Amino acid sequence: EEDIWFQKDKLYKEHIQEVLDKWTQIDDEIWAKVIVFERNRRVAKAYARAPVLTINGSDDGFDGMRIGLCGFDNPMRDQKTDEMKRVIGQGVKIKMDDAGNILIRRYAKSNVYVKSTASSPNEETSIGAEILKLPNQALESEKIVKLFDMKKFQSNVNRELRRAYPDRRRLETQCLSAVAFVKSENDILECPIWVLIVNVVAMDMLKSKL
């Protein structure tokens, strides 16, 4: 009921709003909210304070520095999802640097895919150029790249507020990053196992640009 979506735009919007609604109650050292999905169902939430976060196939769940994706219940899990989760393996590490970039590195033997969070097809992206150049946005083994590029985001924000019809919503979606493990599908809601990362630092800048 409350943890499932049928349209991606609603999913994105809802998670953004969840963060905005609780904004001042969120500890100021939290730089990201990570939400775990299986298909179109949310199975876990985590808040990241530590600069480096590991996301992998461990069954331990969340311990503050590592999200073990197999440590979460899903009563509606389908067979394919169960199969895919078994090979998440070493997954990825993500890190926020001093500039507010989010870096990502693939450790998994299995593939990891970066997905666009755009609501509308004509929206700008905060995804780094190095990822955009990859076929199907599939991460290369053990190479560090910018999942979220703060320079790009800032530039997009500046461009937006100079447009004839500025819309903060197109900006808000750029505060989101999506990473699908093991298996890519064209539609994010069909991916067997993926995470949504809300960049709180990026949102905080948006809240400072009325």
CATH code of the domain in which 108 resides: 2.60.200.10
The tally of domains found in the chain comes to: 1
Please report which residue ranges of the chain form alpha helices under DSSP H: 8-21, 79-85, 129-132, 150-160, 168-173, 200-206
Q: Resolution of the coordinates in A?
A: 1.6
Asked if 84 and 193 touch (Cβ cutoff 8 Å), the reply is yes
- Experimental technique, in short, is X-ray
Q: What is the spatial distance between Cα 50 and Cα 136, in angstroms, rounded to a whole number?
A: 29
Sheet with 112-115, edge to edge strand ranges: 41-48, 32-38, 194-199, 176-181, 112-115
Please report which residue ranges of 31-167 form alpha helices under DSSP H: 79-85, 129-132, 150-160
Three-state DSSP class for 7?
Answer: coil
| Percent composition of the chain: helix, strand, coil (DSSP 3-state, to 5) | 30, 30, 45
The single residue listed with the structure tokens 């994706």 is 69
The single residue listed with the structure tokens 């979606």 is 173
Number of C-beta neighbours around residue 185 at 10 A: 14
* Angle, alpha carbons 108-198-155 (nearest 5°): 105
The single residue listed with the structure tokens 């979460």 is 72
* Angle, alpha carbons 2-73-106 (nearest 5°): 100
Is the alpha carbon torsion for 81, 82, 84, 89 positive or negative?
positive
Residue 148 lies in domain: 1-210
The two three-digit tokens of residue 169, written as one number: 């919503």
Q: What is the spatial distance between Cα 1 and Cα 62, in angstroms, rounded to a whole number?
A: 24
The two three-digit tokens of residue 113, written as one number: 């895919």
